[PDB]
Design a binder for this molecule. Structure first.
Ligand SMILES: NCC(=O)NS(=O)(=O)OC[C@H]1O[C@@H](n2cnc3c(N)ncnc32)[C@H](O)[C@@H]1O
Ligand SMILES: NCC(=O)NS(=O)(=O)OC[C@H]1O[C@@H](n2cnc3c(N)ncnc32)[C@H](O)[C@@H]1O
Ligand SMILES: [Cl-]
Ligand SMILES: [Cl-]
Ligand SMILES: [Cl-]
Ligand SMILES: [Cl-]
Ligand SMILES: [Mg+2]
Ligand SMILES: [Mg+2]
Lengths: 401, 401
């Protein structure tokens, strides 16, 4: 099973560790190791660039994990965010702030990042001077008391989301819903996930969250036992539910004033809400490849956690100086690895297994011509390149990182 | 008072908003607005590059906010992480995982990120193949039930830290403590904080945390009422306290085996632990400048949240096309702003107030020569540059972003 093989790879090479492994570990709680944090950050950079900073109609925020409790009463989560089990059980995590543990310092950890955006809608309109159609994007931790946490990092109690609320004139919501479904689906494909392992699934009206009139899920073919498909991201039409309920509960006008047409209306909201940690899982699974056999993690070079590995042909004291000066130069621009242990052939394979797009070998000939050998991960091609031109050579091939 | 003037600027321009402002707001809980999230991320990038990816002896991780409870018993936080008030009160925030609220699903939100590093020490040594002296760095949220939260974002219950644990041979700890004090102090100065507004303060032995044998604080002259200095970052020698106590409580050997010299020892730990949100506060305060008067936020261009502003001389329908094509081009590489509202003079000043290093004006002459005017924030100089060479012109001046 590819999924089991990929999970074991992730653990073995330090993409992830079980949180508190030495004490047993919380239920499917996971830490991200050296390779994992870089891959996770690279995914965040690509989402932020595509959804926020690369666009002229979206701005970002970073709201607090712990908001005033009334936020989650007004949003309705207090009332309906529960599941029956064996009695109804609310899935929000609780904490108590301040010196007294009275039900007065009670707060909820956010189960979604969306509400921190909604309650700031008027703030952002004011300081960013935005007019619908425009969006507010955010990446951060959310918390849910999942009853059956598992499937690796697919379903955890602590996870990270990448959510954007796109505020539009109500009569335009349907075409903007289609736009963002297509835009988000294509984001995964642009970053290397095979089109055939993705699909769209529309929620039946009885499977809609309390805030949505229509949700379309982007699903990935993870390879689970039974049904191998799993929700990767939800794109929902939340209409004016969220701004209306916070205006009603807070007493603050959250409508938008269209100065041009002197009209006041509450925008509708289209919301792409992706799972950072689930996308992490999907990119690894889809990249995994068993090509005289070879294991290759064929990650988009923009996502690969290590962009290049400097590998001296041997531990020889004459190779180290030139190789270490090169690594120091490349580290100014990218995350790179240095490895002189063992047969160079096994070191190539070690890098291929974690998706490193390029290996740079400093051999004995490098001391007479001042050039090195660059190996491409997928094709295993081999080009000889001037030491002073290696950074340029890699920059052209890592553009967008 | 500069500090009050800077706080009000931050709120007014959307560097920060009070969390849940429309409902009153948690005690000194703050959201980061469009400008703030970019500045915060830019600070994180500079720390990660300087402490982690730019070095050959440090790797990163991202451990969970919520670890197994036994982590915080073993660390001693359960026993001693309390302050007397009016009775001793533990300052860790609590939550309950799982369906039962018995004192069995009880967990603590981490009051520091360090413990997630320590319990993974053997994991990281294994998968990253590191040998002391080496470090493990991390950025993430921490939580403390501060009794008197205030001073803006200086002391909050939810905040972000940038911590690195540098594991060394015990006999080398003192010189590595000096190294990291100097390295961290200089990081702030390299990013533009005036040397005279920083100082070092050594904790008296009676003011040492339970895990440290010696702590030196980097303090910044925030301008508080009374004593204007405040802790910006702590660099502590935690000796072998943390690895020893987790080995003792978990039963897992967390020593390091030096294969070369066949010696087994528990490394000492030097720990730079910075406050992301406090550094955010310090960079704003120190950049604030009142130079015919002008208000300028003189942020290092690597930190500035908006790298360039595209400003058509007017709303004229002939300027928009060329200006919008330029903004679209620059957004491929940087966060940029577009503003055609009001007198160009006031738009320059609007950008200066938030530290934008460059304004790019598309005037009527631009349509006959296909060049634009670039204005430098600090000097207000003005250079005429070919449309097709603007990205190169800015890239050279934003290197390191
Ligand atoms: N704001 C709208 C919304 O929240 N919508 S959604 O509730 O559908 O979660 C949005 C995304 O968060 C991810 N996600 C959700 N729950 C979990 C979990 N327990 N573990 C990991 N990832 C998860 C998943 O990728 C899902 O598509
Ligand atoms: N691991 C070692 C350590 O934790 N050490 S330290 O406890 O000293 O916190 C480290 C840093 O976190 C920041 N910091 C601490 N508490 C707060 C707070 N309540 N609000 C904002 N920033 C804070 C501050 O910048 C401080 O220097
Ligand atoms: Cl756009
Ligand atoms: Cl404003
Ligand atoms: Cl180094
Ligand atoms: Cl390994
Ligand atoms: Mg869903
Ligand atoms: Mg301190």
């Amino acid at each position: 099973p590819v999924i089991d093989t990929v999970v074991n790879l992730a653990k073995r090479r330090g993409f992830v560790y079980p949180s508190g492994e030495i004490y047993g570990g919380t239920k499917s709680a996971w830490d991200y190791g050296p390779l994992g944090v870089e891959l996770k950050e690279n995914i965040k950079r690509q989402w932020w660039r595509s959804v926020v900073t690369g666009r002229d109609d979206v701005v970002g925020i970073d709201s607090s994990i712990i908001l005033p409790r009334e936020v989650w009463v007004a949003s309705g989560h207090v009332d309906v965010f529960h599941d029956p089990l064996v009695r109804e059980f609310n899935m929000m995590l609780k904490t108590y702030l301040g010196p007294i543990e009275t039900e007065e310092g009670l707060h909820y950890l956010r189960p979604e990042t969306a509400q921190g955006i909604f309650v700031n809608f008027a703030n952002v309109v004011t300081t960013a001077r935005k007019k619908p159609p425009f969006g507010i994007g955010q990446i951060g931790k959310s918390f849910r008391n999942e009853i059956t946490p598992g499937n690796f990092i697919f379903r955890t109690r602590e996870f990270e989301q990448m959510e954007m609320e796109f505020f539009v004139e109500p009569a335009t919501a349907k075409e903007w819903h289609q736009y963002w479904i297509d835009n988000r689906l294509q984001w995964y494909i642009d970053l290397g996930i095979r089109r055939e392992n993705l699909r769209l699934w529309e929620h039946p009206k009885d499977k809609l969250s309390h805030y949505s009139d229509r949700t379309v899920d982007i699903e990935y073919k993870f390879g689970f036992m039974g049904n191998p498909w799993g929700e990767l991201e939800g794109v929902a039409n939340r209409t004016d539910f969220d701004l209306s309920t916070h205006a009603r509960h807070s007493g603050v006008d959250l409508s938008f004033y269209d100065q041009i047409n002197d009209v006041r209306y509450t925008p509708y909201v289209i919301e792409p809400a992706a799972g950072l940690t689930r996308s992490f899982m999907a990119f690894l699974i889809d990249a995994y490849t068993e090509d005289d056999k070879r294991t290759v993690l064929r990650l988009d070079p923009r996502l690969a956690p290590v962009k290049a590995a400097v590998l001296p042909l041997s531990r020889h004291a004459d190779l180290s100086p030139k190789a270490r000066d090169l690594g120091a130069e490349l580290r100014k621009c990218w995350n790179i690895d240095f490895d002189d242990a063992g047969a160079i052939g096994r070191r190539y394979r070690r890098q291929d297994e974690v998706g490193t797009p390029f290996c740079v070998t400093v051999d004995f000939d490098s001391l007479q011509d001042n050039a090195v050998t660059v190996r491409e991960r997928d094709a295993m091609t081999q080009d000889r390149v001037a030491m002073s031109s290696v950074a340029d050579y890699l920059a052209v091939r890592l553009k967008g990182s």
